[PDB]
């Protein structure tokens, strides 16, 4: 009694409604500090005339 | 040497005939690694 | 996960016995396990469960008092000591396992487990 604990699980079933499916989720975060910029994007060549 | 941020190193190979001290003379050195690390560095050490 | 039974057999009545039950695979940290038994042409009856992690203990009201349960981690075991038995607790006992992380612990009563061992006959002379 008012000792619960923290966690639950999801039920995820095949059959179970698109709002309780399951969904992989990545949350991706940009940091720039005082240190070398490391992840470039592609930057992308031409030819060469 | 550790600058801006990057760690630098240079180096040259040279042939020598002298047991003492460094040989006098002259030879330039090109870098090898140019390392973007970011890292404060004061100190360090050599292993052997 | 698997799960394998041991310890049914024959005894008498206000005797005691222990059933074993090793738990192998996936041992959560924060899951459960728990004794039901099933009597011939009756239903699944839950027994008791307990919580993997601290140990704490629910017990259906047919066995509180007389059944105790416990569980050993190092050995991923969890052991039923059936004390004071009686004519009516006669069934096959299985142990099964709670994937399902409830916080509240009378839940395992009534939560439709994931995975049963084979089971182990109890008779009660
Ligand atoms: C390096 O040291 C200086 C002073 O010693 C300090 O201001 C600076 O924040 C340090 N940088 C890092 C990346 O630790």
């Known amino acids: 009694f008012n000792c619960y604990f923290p966690l639950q699980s999801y039920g995820f079933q095949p059959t179970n409604g698109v709002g309780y499916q399951p969904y992989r989720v990545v949350v991706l975060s940009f940091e720039l500090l005082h240190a070398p910029a490391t992840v470039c994007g592609p930057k992308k060549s031409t030819n060469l005339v | 040497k550790n600058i801006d941020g990057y760690f630098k190193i240079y180096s040259k190979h040279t042939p020598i005939n002298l047991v003492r001290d460094l040989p006098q003379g002259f030879s330039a050195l090109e870098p090898l690694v140019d390392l973007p690390i970011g890292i404060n560095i004061t100190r360090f050490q050599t292993l052997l | 996960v698997q799960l394998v039974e041991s310890g049914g057999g024959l005894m008498q009545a206000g005797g005691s016995l222990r059933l074993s039950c090793a738990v192998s695979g996936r041992t959560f940290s924060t899951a459960a396990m728990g004794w039901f038994r099933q009597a011939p042409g009756k239903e699944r009856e839950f027994v008791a469960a307990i919580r993997w992690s601290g140990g704490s203990a629910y017990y259906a009201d047919s066995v509180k008092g007389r059944f105790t349960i416990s569980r050993d981690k190092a050995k991923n075991t969890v052991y039923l000591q059936m004390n004071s038995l009686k004519y009516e607790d006669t069934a096959v006992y299985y142990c099964?396992?709670?994937?399902?992380?409830?916080?509240?612990?009378?839940?395992?009563?009534?939560?439709?487990?994931?995975?049963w061992g084979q089971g182990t006959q109890v008779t009660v002379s």
């Open positions: 099964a396992s709670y994937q399902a992380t409830r916080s509240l612990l009378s839940d395992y009563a009534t939560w439709p487990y994931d995975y």
